[PDB]
């Protein structure tokens, strides 16, 4: 199934994860059909350690919607924020 999760990540000075996807982006390693923004790698001793995992779909960040967001806009937002970033993600969970 799926679930939404709030995730706070404190930049130090990066978030410590990578993303792929977005409208106008090249897709993602997880779902062919989805234009969403997906977490693809998490630095193991970085700020997102234990909080995010590859395959998490970002649908909001500091109150900005990431649903069908363009690739460049998502990168710009995440890179522009400072200090704390409050994410909402959709995580797939084992049946």
């Amino acid at each position: 199934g799926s679930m939404e999760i709030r995730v706070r990540v404190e930049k130090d000075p990066e978030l410590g994860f990578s993303i792929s996807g977005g409208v106008g982006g090249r897709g993602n390693p997880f779902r062919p059909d989805d234009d969403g923004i997906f977490v693809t790698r998490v630095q193991p001793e970085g700020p997102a350690s234990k909080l995010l995992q590859p395959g998490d779909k970002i649908i909001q960040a500091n109150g900005y919607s990431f649903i069908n967001i363009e690739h460049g806009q998502a990168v710009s937002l995440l890179k522009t924020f400072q200090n704390t970033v409050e994410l909402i993600i959709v995580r797939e969970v084992s049946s």
């Binding site: 990066e14 994860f17 990578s18 792929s20 090249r26 995440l78």
Partner: peptide, 5 residues
């Protein structure tokens, strides 16, 4: 290419 943030 993924993008580190």
């Amino acid at each position: 290419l993924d993008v580190p943030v």
